[PDB]
Every structure is written in structure tokens, then in C-alpha cells.
């Protein structure tokens, strides 16, 4: 209901957490947080004293909803939403909520920040991934200064084509939690990947820990003598590593520590995109998104293109982890399932964890929702039931649907209110709510 106290106003952001149960609202450099099932009043924490925002800043929230990351091309701030506190007066207690800060000027030619993401599987959301104009990707441990940031995809002293991955436009984590997909532009658009891309303390539940252990065992058995020597090495390394994880995994916290040695990994790619649409050779890839299909880490990779087109991809081969190998390719395979031409300028892709097989595409004045659960639901059934038959006949067409007309790329948020899931569309000038089916 747009008639909730936390919403009334006078840069604006809004985020939700725990199945649209908790709301976070940013306005006038003040954080407002309200738990729909727990509080009777909302609370605030004015942070102007620490940071005054300008329309140039981007702010994202950890999925857990416990942390906010505010950043621009020069600096990064990480604040803790005071869930549980009610009267945040103590100037000393309010500074406690300022958890981490970073400026590029902190380094001795300084590349500016292009994008920031929380690592989806870091314990206590303690890891932020930073992509710079550099095409350099860095991981900072928000909770530990006794940790020197890790820099991956460092520049090379090479000449010629493809020394390392250059011209990265977007980043996106696989729903597996251990893989980082990169969309670059050097040649019109390609996909690379860091596997594994681990934080310093990995969030891993028992179900997931056994899933990668078993996948690791299946590949180890899959080894024969024709197998490439470099591949054989990686597969064995993967099994050794995943086994060591299993040995130090803390079941009560569902976490495991990861030594700096295992975190330096070299990019894999480019991935093969089969069959690649001929038209697209004349355009450039814009964004990449990952959409969950079921509850077993099965996902669809989505990529944007200049022509207002979308290609829904599926990874058929199992990758092996790699750390040294340069230009390692191997089972770096993606298959095209469908192409969606929206004939509109796609400005961004967004997903809400609470809704499987659905993707929001923000064009120029519309927010459309591509819904591919028509076929995706069957696709996961066959993957899980090892039966290809169902696929026969199925028309892989996604249901396109206009959500609303916008003017300024709005801020989205899923809000579960009184048995009715909704979508909050936030913009400089407005704050709209809309019903969502399912």
C-alpha cells in the first residue's frame, strides 16, 4: 500500500529483503527500514554526516538485506542497515554502521569504478566485487583489513589479440554461486568466466556442498587417457580443492574459509554460443543476467544487444575449475534456446530472486517482463528426471508483458504484503506499486 508511513517523502532508492518482508528506503541521505511483520513504526539513520549523495551515485543492497553499498566512479561505501536497533542516537553507535570505505585515490594513473556487486556467497556479505575501467576485477573483504584486496584480470605486457579479457561491459554471478560471468565487447560481444570466483569466507549449505563434491567426482571418473593433460590436471585439482573444502566446512554456520592461494583464478573463455544468430554480428552485447529456473541451481543466461534483441542461453557442458591455464577453454559451452526482439533500446536487465524464470527488461519508457516458465519449467523437469521426451514439441516462446511506463530507469523491489506480492517502482518523482501474479 502506497499509504505506508515509511514511503511518504518531502536520489531515492528502495530495496526489500526476506521474501519482500523487510523494506529499506533511502531519501535525503537517510536510511529508513521497516519490517512489515515485526515493527509498528519504521526507523531512521541519517548518514549525511558520512556521505551526501548526488545523482551520480549507484546504491545496491545485499540479498540478505543487511548491507547497502553506495558508490560512484571514485569511491565505495558500505553501510549496515540497523535492523534490530530502534533508537540510533549515539554518534558512536551510528558510526558503527559505517562498515567499509574505499577510494581509488588510495592507490599510489588511477582507473575509475565502473560497477560493484556483492559476492552472492560470502559469509555475512563480507565481499564486494569491483570492476574498473581497467577491465580489472577486484575483491575487497569488507570485514578484514588483514586482507589485501585480490585483483584478477590484471593488465598484461602483451601485444596482439586477447592477452586477457578486455572491454567488459557487464558482470553477473551464476546461480551456482562459484562462477562469475563477464560480458565483453572487444569483438561485438562474448562471454568469459571465472571459475571458481571465491570470497575469503564462502557461504555454503550442506546441500550445495555435496552438489559440487558429487559433480567433482563425476568428472574425476569421466577421466580417460585421450583427455587433454591440462584438463586432467584441473579436474584433479578441482577434486582436491572441493575435498579440502568438505574437510573444513563448518556445518553449524554453513561456511568455510578459503585461503588466498585458491582465490587467484584466470579467466576461461570465450564461451561458444551455439547457434549464434547471424544478424547479431552487426551489433554489440549490452548486458548479461542470470535467471533461476528451479531450486537446483539450474539457470538461463540472458544477454542484451544493440538491436534491442535478447538471447536466452543454456550451459550444457560442465566446466572444470581453473587457476593457472591462460586462455583455458573447455566445456565453456552455451546453447541458444530462444531469441527475443523487443525492438526497443534495452537500458538494463533486472531479476527478483523471488520469481523464477522471469526477467525484467527496462527499455526506454517501458518495463517489460519476459516470462519463460512456459518452457523453462519443463526444461528443468527433464534435466532432473533425465527424460528428454517432454521437450519434443514444446515451443520455446516466452510470454512478453508490459509492466509499466517509466521515464527514468526506476528502482524495483518485490514487496509481499498481506498475501499479495507486489512490485514497487521507484523514481525521482514517483513511487508506484503493482500487483504481481505468483
Amino acid at each position: 500500500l502506497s499509504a505506508l508511513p515509511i514511503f511518504q517523502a518531502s536520489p531515492r532508492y528502495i530495496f526489500s529483503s526476506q521474501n519482500g518482508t523487510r523494506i529499506v528506503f533511502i531519501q535525503d541521505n537517510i536510511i529508513r527500514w521497516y519490517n512489515v511483520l515485526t515493527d509498528s513504526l519504521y526507523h531512521s539513520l541519517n548518514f549525511s554526516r558520512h556521505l551526501v549523495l548526488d545523482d551520480t551515485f549507484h546504491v545496491i543492497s545485499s540479498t540478505s538485506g543487511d548491507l547497502l553499498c553506495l558508490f560512484n566512479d571514485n569511491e565505495i561505501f558500505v553501510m549496515e542497515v540497523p535492523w534490530g536497533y530502534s533508537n540510533v542516537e549515539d554518534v558512536s553507535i551510528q558510526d558503527a554502521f559505517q562498515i567499509f570505505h574505499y577510494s581509488i585515490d588510495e592507490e599510489e594513473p588511477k582507473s575509475s569504478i565502473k560497477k560493484v556487486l556483492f559476492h552472492p556467497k560470502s559469509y555475512r556479505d563480507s565481499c564486494i566485487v569491483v570492476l574498473k575501467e581497467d577491465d580489472t576485477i577486484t575483491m575487497f573483504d569488507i570485514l578484514n583489513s588483514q586482507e589485501k584486496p585480490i585483483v584478477l584480470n590484471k593488465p598484461n605486457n602483451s601485444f596482439g589479440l586477447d592477452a586477457r579479457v578486455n572491454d567488459i561491459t557487464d558482470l553477473e554471478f551464476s546461480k551456482d554461486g562459484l562462477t562469475l560471468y563477464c560480458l565483453n565487447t572487444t569483438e561485438g560481444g562474448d562471454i568469459f568466466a571465472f571459475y571458481p570466483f571465491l570470497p575469503s569466507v564462502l557461504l555454503l549449505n550442506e546441500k550445495d556442498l555435496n552438489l559440487i563434491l558429487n559433480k567433482s567426482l563425476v568428472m574425476y571418473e569421466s577421466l580417460d587417457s585421450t583427455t587433454d593433460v591440462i584438463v586432467k590436471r584441473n579436474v584433479i585439482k578441482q577434486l582436491q580443492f572441493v575435498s579440502k573444502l568438505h574437510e573444513n566446512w563448518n556445518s553449524r554456520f554453513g561456511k568455510v574459509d578459503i585461503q588466498k592461494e585458491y582465490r587467484l583464478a584466470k579467466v576461461q573463455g570465450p564461451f561458444t554460443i551455439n547457434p549464434f544468430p547471424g544478424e547479431l554480428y552487426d551489433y554489440t552485447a549490452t548486458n548479461i543476467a542470470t535467471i533461476l529456473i528451479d531450486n537446483g541451481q539450474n539457470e538461463i543466461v540472458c544477454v542484451s544487444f544493440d538491436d534491442g534483441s535478447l538471447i536466452l542461453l543454456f550451459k550444457d557442458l560442465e566446466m572444470s575449475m581453473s587457476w593457472d591455464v591462460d586462455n583455458y577453454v573447455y566445456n565453456n559451452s552455451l546453447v541458444l534456446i530462444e531469441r527475443v526482439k523487443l525492438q526497443r533500446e534495452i537500458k538494463s536487465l533486472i531479476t527478483l530472486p523471488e520469481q523464477l524464470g522471469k526477467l525484467y527488461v527496462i527499455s526506454d519508457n517501458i518495463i517489460q517482463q519476459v516470462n519463460f516458465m512456459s518452457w523453462a519449467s519443463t526444461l528443468s523437469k527433464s534435466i532432473n528426471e533425465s527424460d528428454l521426451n517432454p521437450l519434443a514439441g514444446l515451443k520455446f516462446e516466452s510470454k512478453l508483458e508490459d509492466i509499466a511506463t517509466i521515464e527514468r530507469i526506476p528502482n524495483l523491489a518485490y514487496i509481499n504484503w498481506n498475501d499479495q506480492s507486489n512490485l514497487a517502482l521507484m523514481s525521482n518523482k514517483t513511487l508506484t506499486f503493482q500487483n504481481i501474479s505468483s
Binding site: 571418473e221 543454456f314 526444461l379 534435466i383 528428454l388
Partner: peptide, 26 residues
């Protein structure tokens, strides 16, 4: 783990599904 056969089967099914979509589009 146990589930190994189960996991290997799923991985193998995905390959088969890979060909399906390869030999579905031109």
C-alpha cells in the same frame, strides 16, 4: 558422496539437451 550416479545422470542429460537445441535452430 552417494548421489554421484544421480548427478552424473543429470550432467549427461544436459549434454543431450545441448544437442537438442543445437539441432533445433539453423
Amino acid at each position: 558422496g552417494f548421489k554421484v550416479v544421480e548427478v552424473g545422470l543429470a550432467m549427461n542429460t544436459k549434454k543431450q539437451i545441448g544437442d537438442f537445441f543445437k539441432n533445433l535452430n539453423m
